[PDB]
Paper text:
In the work presented herein we have determined the crystal structures of the shaft protein [name], in both mature and precursor forms, the anchor protein [name] and a truncated precursor form of the tip protein, Mfa3. The resulting mature protein thereby has an empty position in the first β-sheet that a β-strand donated from another fimbrial protein presumably fills in order to polymerize the individual proteins into a polymeric fimbria.
The anchor protein [name] does not contain any Rgp/Kgp processing sites and is in contrast to [name] and Mfa3 considered to begin its mature sequence at the lipidated cysteine (Cys29) directly following the signal peptide. The full mature form, ranging from residues 29–324 was expressed, purified and crystallized. The final [name] model consists of residues 40–320, and is built up from two β-sandwich domains (N- and C-domain) and measures 85 × 35 × 25 Å in size. Importantly, [name] is stabilised by two disulphide bonds, a feature not present in [name], Mfa3 or Mfa425. The first is formed between Cys54 and Cys285 and links the long β1β2-loop of the N-domain with a loop from the C-domain at the domain interface. The second disulphide is observed between Cys298 and Cys300, rigidifying the turn leading up to the penultimate and ultimate strands of the structure.
Author numbering: 40 to 274, 279 to 320
The structure:
């Protein structure tokens, strides 16, 4: 007698009043872990079109409590670790962003999604126990698009914006695995006479590890600015658990000190003045 959980995938961010069903999610990796956090089921679905009334069957066999972990748009940008049924556990590393040294592969134009379903339960069918069961899971986007401008700066082509974060590795549950920091590829436009703009696509932005935004004078290598992006943020208005796009302005000014060097004296994020210096 065959058994399983039907799962419906939605996206409702917490600031959203109605659930969404993002077209951005094109494929799925859905795992089932049991009472012990051991992998019991591993499934892959291509051609995903999330919908209000669409479901996906997650095969199970033995009665019990299960939680489902779901990943959207797992790509060949990622090094996938061991996945072994009856062995692999919830907190092992599923995934590492592919890197070249400490530089991330460029993931602009990609979305990455995670959901945890509630705990569900296959009950003894020999007694009063349904069919298959059903549940829903909320896909939260883990990718973040971060635009940064450094303003009022002579020779803006001589400066480089960098974004480091220890956020390229994830456990089976959606949590960030500990790792060395990862630099993300900052594609650049000198936009103004005194302005330089960089665009980063990074993964999850949360406290608990390095999330360093920095500005460096390339010819000398002199880092003129460094701050923890998440820290700056959580100093809102700017709620990381509902948002995924970050327009950041860094206002530079000559230091007036005997270093004849520039410094950052204002950091704006999504239109809020976060810190003056």
């Amino acid at each position: 007698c065959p058994r399983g959980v039907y799962v419906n995938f939605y996206s409702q961010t917490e600031c959203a009043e109605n659930p969404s069903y993002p077209a951005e999610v094109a494929r799925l990796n859905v795992y089932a872990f049991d009472k012990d956090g051991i992998l019991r089921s591993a499934n892959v679905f291509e051609d995903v079109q999330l919908s209000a009334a669409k479901e996906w069957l997650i095969p199970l066999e033995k009665d019990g409590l299960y939680t489902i972990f779901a990943w959207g748009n797992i790509d060949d940008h990622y090094n996938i670790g061991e996945i072994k049924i009856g062995e692999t556990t919830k907190q092992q590393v599923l995934m590492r962003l592919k890197q070249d040294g400490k530089w991330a592969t460029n993931i602009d134009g990609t979305t990455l999604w995670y959901a945890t379903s509630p705990v569900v339960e296959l009950k003894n069918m020999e007694d009063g126990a349904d069919q298959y069961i059903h549940t829903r899971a909320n896909l939260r986007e883990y990718t973040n698009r971060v635009t940064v401008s450094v303003d009022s700066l002579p020779h803006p082509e001589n400066y480089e914006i960098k974004l480091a974060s220890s956020n390229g590795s994830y456990r089976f549950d959606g949590t960030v695995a500990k790792a060395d920091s990862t630099y993300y590829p900052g594609e650049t436009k000198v936009v103004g006479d005194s302005t330089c703009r960089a665009f980063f696509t990074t993964l999850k932005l949360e406290s608990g590890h390095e999330n360093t935004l920095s500005v460096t004078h390339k010819p000398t290598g002199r880092e003129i600015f460094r701050t923890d992006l998440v820290g700056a943020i959580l100093s809102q208005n700017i709620n990381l658990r509902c948002i995924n796009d970050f327009d950041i302005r860094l206002v530079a000014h000559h230091c007036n000190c005997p270093d004849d060097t520039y410094v950052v004296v204002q950091i704006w994020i999504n239109g809020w003045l976060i810190h003056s210096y």
